[PDB]
Design a binder for this molecule. Structure first.
Ligand SMILES: [Zn+2]
Ligand SMILES: [Zn+2]
Ligand SMILES: [Zn+2]
Ligand SMILES: [Zn+2]
Ligand SMILES: [Zn+2]
Ligand SMILES: [Zn+2]
Ligand SMILES: [Zn+2]
Ligand SMILES: [Zn+2]
Ligand SMILES: [Zn+2]
Ligand SMILES: [Zn+2]
Ligand SMILES: [Zn+2]
Ligand SMILES: [Zn+2]
Ligand SMILES: [Zn+2]
Ligand SMILES: [Zn+2]
Ligand SMILES: [Zn+2]
Ligand SMILES: [Zn+2]
Ligand SMILES: [Zn+2]
Ligand SMILES: [Zn+2]
Ligand SMILES: [Zn+2]
Ligand SMILES: [Zn+2]
Ligand SMILES: [Zn+2]
Ligand SMILES: [Zn+2]
Ligand SMILES: [Zn+2]
Ligand SMILES: [Zn+2]
Lengths: 51, 51, 53, 53, 51, 53, 53, 51, 53, 51, 51, 53
């Protein structure tokens, strides 16, 4: 499944993590990414609309 | 620059090509990709809004 | 076998997926690909023309 | 550009070679490939259908 | 063993497949390859003389 | 040297880009990264803290 | 998981090793790294600041 | 062109070298390879019939 | 362990194969290699000089 | 030659850099490495005895 | 664990092998390596002081 | 051509280096290697037996 418990965007936050398709994202990173597009630049798949 | 003159999505069309960021896209492919998101799944950068 | 359930062409669609040889394809993408050739540009093998039973 | 002058399908024929997109193909191999699809299994791009001037 | 059931030369035929050393070959491809040499250009090992 | 002018973190922003060590970063991304550490997770070198003359 | 028990920074120390995220670090190396940043240059993830129970 | 002047089969002989397609072959190696097939196992292309 | 039973030097012979360290060698190839050195050019380890019981 | 001007051990210091064999080292890192052995763990070659 | 039973330095000796950290070393090679530094050039870790 | 002037076997010696085929070797290492075989374990080609004019 998903690797180690860290936001694959900022490689630092381990709490308040949302499950992206094959990796994790912290809330702050997820927000900024949703701000810019519906598609994740890390895994090329759609971003979580949850939380 | 960009490689050989072919739509990097369908690898077939060579005419009516729009310049994506580091590759090409035919009009049909570009449309279907814009239909789904503003971000290109091939190069992870924004899709051309031109044409 | 086949990876996460997303169209490997558009990396977005997750429902209405047809099984290509080692990946998936949504109907819209599959249609456009068949429009151009019987051979898939992603896996080099023949595109699914039929959904079976 | 294109590599040594040999059919990239059979790696043997060196005369009567047609230019595929980034490699060569002998007539026999090209014929057999066109028999199966318009798309080349070696370079994923369209097979040469015409030899030009 | 051998991978997916397809002629590794033409990547299309799935019926009437002969077992080459670590891959498959359709009858038409096998014939053309035997026409040219006893050694397979795909796996570098000897071609099947069967069928 | 540095590649195409896009923020290597969000791969979208192309204006208001700051030069990180071997890539670019938009202000929003850079701000969020500085919030977390002085070291860039993309290139492992220190984040730009100052824009120079 | 984590590899052979040696500090991945100095590849020499094998006792007094702290667990970084996917490797080890001796106290001396860890100290010097914390001196420079909270983020590890070897694995790009945060340096261990605390040894736990 | 061809790399360093050594038989790519035995990696030892540097004299009496025949030019194979993208490498070299000493006379002894070339003979043994021709003994077995017309196709070179190193470069997958036809063996030199010269010498 | 060792792969398909073919001489890794000539990729053709499948009978009368001697076990080199991580691959096979036919007698003819092995003979020619011993003629040149005690060390195998394919696996960098010593050539089999003896077949054992 | 050597790459970007940063200590290849700590990837942070850019001043007071000593030239190791194919990379750089800051004074603090060089000291700690010399403390432990004469051979550099980054490039496998001998450490600078200068400074 | 360690791979095949051969000195990873000279790739020839299989007897009188000392266990280095993730490979083997024959006595002669180990001596010459210790002669030059305490750190192994093959695996970057400390050399065996045993034997 | 050949890289930095260090014995590729012991990665330490930089003087008294003999030119092997695509790298260097110090006399001590070369001697030990010749002791074992005429073929170099590093580059798979023959060891230098003679230094020329
Ligand atoms: Zn984050
Ligand atoms: Zn994602
Ligand atoms: Zn297209
Ligand atoms: Zn694109
Ligand atoms: Zn799709
Ligand atoms: Zn497919
Ligand atoms: Zn051909
Ligand atoms: Zn082609
Ligand atoms: Zn076929
Ligand atoms: Zn075959
Ligand atoms: Zn950004
Ligand atoms: Zn950076
Ligand atoms: Zn350490
Ligand atoms: Zn770490
Ligand atoms: Zn030879
Ligand atoms: Zn050849
Ligand atoms: Zn053989
Ligand atoms: Zn061998
Ligand atoms: Zn440093
Ligand atoms: Zn160094
Ligand atoms: Zn040894
Ligand atoms: Zn070692
Ligand atoms: Zn040496
Ligand atoms: Zn050598």
């Amino acid at each position: 499944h998903l690797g180690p418990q860290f936001c694959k965007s900022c490689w630092f936050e381990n709490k308040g993590l949302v499950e992206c398709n094959n990796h994790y994202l912290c809330l702050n990173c997820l927000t900024l990414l949703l701000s810019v597009s519906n598609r994740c630049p890390i895994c090329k798949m759609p971003l979580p609309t949850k939380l």
